[PDB]
Write a protein that binds this ligand. Structure first.
Ligand SMILES: Nc1ncnc2c1ncn2[C@@H]1O[C@H](CO)[C@@H](O)[C@H]1O
Ligand SMILES: Nc1ncnc2c1ncn2[C@@H]1O[C@H](CO)[C@@H](O)[C@H]1O
Ligand SMILES: Nc1ncnc2c1ncn2[C@@H]1O[C@H](CO)[C@@H](O)[C@H]1O
Ligand SMILES: Nc1ncnc2c1ncn2[C@@H]1O[C@H](CO)[C@@H](O)[C@H]1O
Ligand SMILES: Nc1ncnc2c1ncn2[C@@H]1O[C@H](CO)[C@@H](O)[C@H]1O
Ligand SMILES: Nc1ncnc2c1ncn2[C@@H]1O[C@H](CO)[C@@H](O)[C@H]1O
Lengths: 230, 230, 230, 230, 230, 230
């Protein structure tokens, strides 16, 4: 019922997992959901809804960047009355102690975007992950006993960042990893009194380049279980 | 050879047409190119290369938003040595005299993004379309005798814009239409001494909602011919 | 050994509780610590160190505003090798569902300050509370079974804010309460690979004015116990 | 009928050529217009109106800087119902391939001014030259067969720019030349649904100092003829 | 010896009076200086040097806007080793208690320009008038017993200001009058360890429109005498 | 009658001297005022009112930073109808010619705060000291024949400033000293049609570290006498 979604209210579960890659979503739909049904494929976005441990859960792509994820997340909350959105995906390690394949759970996300300043009267909005979702994720990691780091992430507008010193600065402040959507996502969830969260598997390290599926599967378990808890 | 493209240098034509929808690109690939070959489908992006009037031309999706298109455009220029990128797609009419289905050729694009300020020492960068591409497009429209408006466009970071007064302001300054990529695209082309341009078919009017394929096909002709001229 | 502290390295415990009022700190020192010794009273700041359940703990005032708390927090981390700083105090309720006397635990803090933009290359820094401290506080509340809300806070530079619409905006985004130090505190902790956190008792509601000690004592228990856990 | 103009509605032609130097305008008035009549000399601005190939055309000085040209341009459009303003003058080459005496036709103009952000809700306004005026100028150059470069210009607020790195940055993005008025001019034309344009003769190169009248006369021909076409 | 001045080092007095209008400067040169000699008329700027009470003093136009006055002032300080520049001219009353024809002596000048933020690491630079010049002016007014108000002025980049609420805001903060050069002037004087100052005669009131030469002559006396004192 | 003051309207003199240190205020109260009575000690702020040469005068602490002093100053003007506030204290020398123990009288104060931009529609507000207070202070210094420098000061939000180049920049523009309150103070005085001023004794030099009471006492005399004059 939207310019980017053909699904009707009800086609989506209250809990939706999203990742940038629409093909990764199709994969997750096939691989982890039982009886998954494609509910929306506008712009080949790959929107499915199935079940996990009997619970209804949807998975869909969100593209790259805060602008993209902002369209989808706002529609899902606003139109499809989705209650929870967990962002699963990859990212770039920033902190030196964070290594490739390490799983990271965002508490918050910084950004070089202007979106939040535009929504927050040009002030500093703390793009924070829903504490419930952060707890469910961390609990799920604990229960599964899957090591994972928890802290700040960075949603960059520039994948190829001209400001080469930013990386180092972030390291000094111990930002865990960098991606391109969380910062835009979190505030939207707030606006709708809904919940948002993010957990990514470090695909590489930006401050020095250093089996990769096991990490993805582990991140996916942590996410799926946390969804049940939510 | 990139994190978002599997194609090797050479798989892409010097002139590439891009649109947000990866399915629209597949459609254009099938519909308008002869012997199209999928050169890249990372993130289901839908990258093809074929020929038109015997000339090599590629078509690929670029997602939504300056962050997304910025990744692709930079890689195509930088890695695949693409010389020209024409953005074809839809947009929202802003000016009152601009109506749905009207075809628009961007001279430049404004934005509420921070990307260009980040690349231009926090100054006003005039995200301008390559004059060659603007000429080729306008000439193609003239030759084909297909009416089309030429002027400013707006690349919004917020599809659903909280600043409801912006629309009206843009109308006062006669911005033709609003989309989500041009502003990011144009400066990247400049940086690489390459060429960029945009031509969109107004899918709707934001200041008041007011066969749609004929307009698309007309926009597509104007673009394809302009590519030959380029 | 500083321009604002006479105490020598060692006079402060690894865990320090701070509040704006230097008299409140003296009160907490007397009331909750055993054998408290005034370690610093430069600018009548009221710095004490004593014990709680046998563990060493310091309490000191931090003044009002990010500039003030930024001087103290940086010195404590940098010079006195303090590992944890929990901010205890009052605040103004913003969210409609938050009421006077309700205890609030900050996950993060937004701000209309420029400090963080100055430290973060003019980007959005997510002033986030240390997850360990947020957990210890929430666990302590759970163990003590003392209801408390957890979410975003706002560190205003303007106690008397000229931008009368901000309050309402924050309510729309569900900011829990507003104070004047957290936002400055959190990033400094990050810079020093240390920990920071905040828990305040809502002294009033800014969107409509609506025994007060019981709430303070409850907040104080939650804080003291969380400190032991840390 | 204004604080900066004594001329009454009608004293100015629909097409007005302006340059910073009021003496250059007097020169152009004498040299290129037939039967020129001084219509305004408030602040010795040097406003004339005469004819060229029988068509009415005015020439006047506009001072230096966006603030100055903004006063004049707004009055001419608003009060004297001027339809077209072509800015003729000098500038500093920025691009390495651009040399002294080269004639440049602006497509758009960037700036380190705050004026446009003030008129555009603190967003990036693409100070673009009217496509009609850009075409008329380029056509006139083509018809006259006078080589001229077409691209971005920069309207600096600081002739003596403290940010010594800006120049180099602009070169990387291939800005053609730098002046001090276009950026302010273009948006005003838009606001009045009128037309603006600029064509300057490079008086020097800022990135390395490298008969000068022939270039001026050529630029002047291109401008005068383009005016007839407009 | 500059792009905007033909005079050689020595042609200008250590103390220079400047006003926007080049014709007003010629008038002041003729009217108030003995044996005035035109030292520079590039861009018809009208630069003279003569004597007053036997002391050498120059008068020259500076155009409109911070960009214009910034070129001249920097050259005069830098190249012509001018020690003092007093800005004389007109302005618009802002404060309700300030009336047309009232003479105003600026202590400082605010602005909506970006120039000073560009010179001051994007911080708030207090564009302040040299205390010596402010004293000399106020003393001269006192000695001459010519009533004059002393306080903040505003250097606008937009003579025709789109932000119609600014005026009222300035009134609330009691800004005395608005012009277009001081704010740019003052910081340049600082940079050169030189002196700058401003004294204007209110030509009109912006918050409500309410012999005019007597006021000008009085302002001129105050300025000339203050120059002798300097 | 405020959240930070228990004194009732009348407990404060029309002229109030404030310094960061609440203990310094108590000292000044004891040392320089006759029959001083503590009127407010909320947050141990140390508010006294006594007499000097028979005239009523109050002294109180204001904490550190613009946020802190902004709360107090606004309440004193607004609630306690205070007419004049003179800020006395310490500061850091910036200018090379300014030495430790030198007394400085602020004409204005720059800042890296965002407070004034928040009160001034994101424009440059010239945080200027009341000319009456600047005169009274300078006259008092002259009468007492106590050397003192007069010029720009800087109110930093970051005592420990990350932007290590700022210091040098300020030196180039000849900023006299740096503190943390003036910039916030001055504009508030304006808003209330009241008067504010500042005079500090340089406790150290930031660009190179170089009996200290004599300087303080001298600064205190200058202030007390200026208060009588006011
Ligand atoms: N190093 C990285 N930088 C930015 N985005 C990353 C990175 N690694 C993975 N991503 C994610 O994948 C896409 C960018 O390639 C975005 O969806 C982003 O969130
Ligand atoms: N009205 C509109 N606003 C923003 N983007 C639009 C609009 N219409 C079409 N688009 C385009 O389609 C996507 C947004 O739906 C983006 O790729 C954008 O360029
Ligand atoms: N409503 C409020 N607004 C701002 N600060 C508050 C509020 N309530 C309590 N505070 C706290 O007390 C002081 C402001 O009175 C600061 O230390 C601040 O953190
Ligand atoms: N190099 C340059 N930099 C800025 N302005 C220039 C330059 N060359 C010529 N100009 C023009 O002349 C004046 C500045 O000397 C302005 O009108 C400006 O447009
Ligand atoms: N009301 C006003 N607004 C802006 N500038 C003014 C005003 N009155 C006089 N001026 C001065 O005259 C010119 C603007 O007309 C500038 O030099 C400016 O300093
Ligand atoms: N060098 C300095 N930098 C900042 N503030 C200073 C300095 N010296 C003294 N101060 C003052 O003392 C406190 C900072 O230590 C603030 O009240 C501030 O005004």
């Amino acid at each position: 019922a939207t310019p980017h979604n053909s699904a009707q209210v009800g086609d989506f579960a209250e809990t939706v997992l999203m990742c940038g890659d629409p093909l990764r979503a199709k994969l997750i739909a096939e691989t982890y959901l039982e009886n998954p049904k494609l509910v929306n494929n506008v712009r080949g976005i790959q929107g499915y809804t199935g079940t996990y441990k009997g619970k209804p859960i949807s998975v869909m792509g969100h593209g790259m960047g805060l602008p993209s994820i902002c369209i989808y997340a706002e529609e899902l909350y606003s139109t499809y009355k989705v209650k929870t959105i967990i962002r699963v995906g990859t990212c770039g390690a920033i902190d030196m102690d964070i290594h490739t394949r390490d799983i990271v759970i965002f508490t918050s996300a910084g950004t070089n975007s202007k979106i939040n300043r535009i929504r927050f009267m040009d002030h500093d909005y703390p793009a924070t992950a829903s504490f419930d979702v952060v707890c469910a994720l961390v609990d799920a990691a604990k229960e599964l006993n899957i090591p994972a780091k928890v802290g700040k992430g960075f949603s960059t507008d520039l994948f190829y960042n001209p400001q080469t010193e930013l990386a180092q600065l972030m390291n000094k402040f111990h930002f865990l990893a960098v991606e391109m959507e969380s910062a835009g996502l979190f505030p939207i969830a707030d606006l709708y009194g809904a919940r948002a969260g993010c957990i990514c598997t470090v695909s590489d390290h930006i401050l020095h380049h250093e089996e990769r599926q096991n990490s993805f599967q582990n991140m996916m378990k942590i996410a799926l279980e946390a969804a049940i808890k939510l």
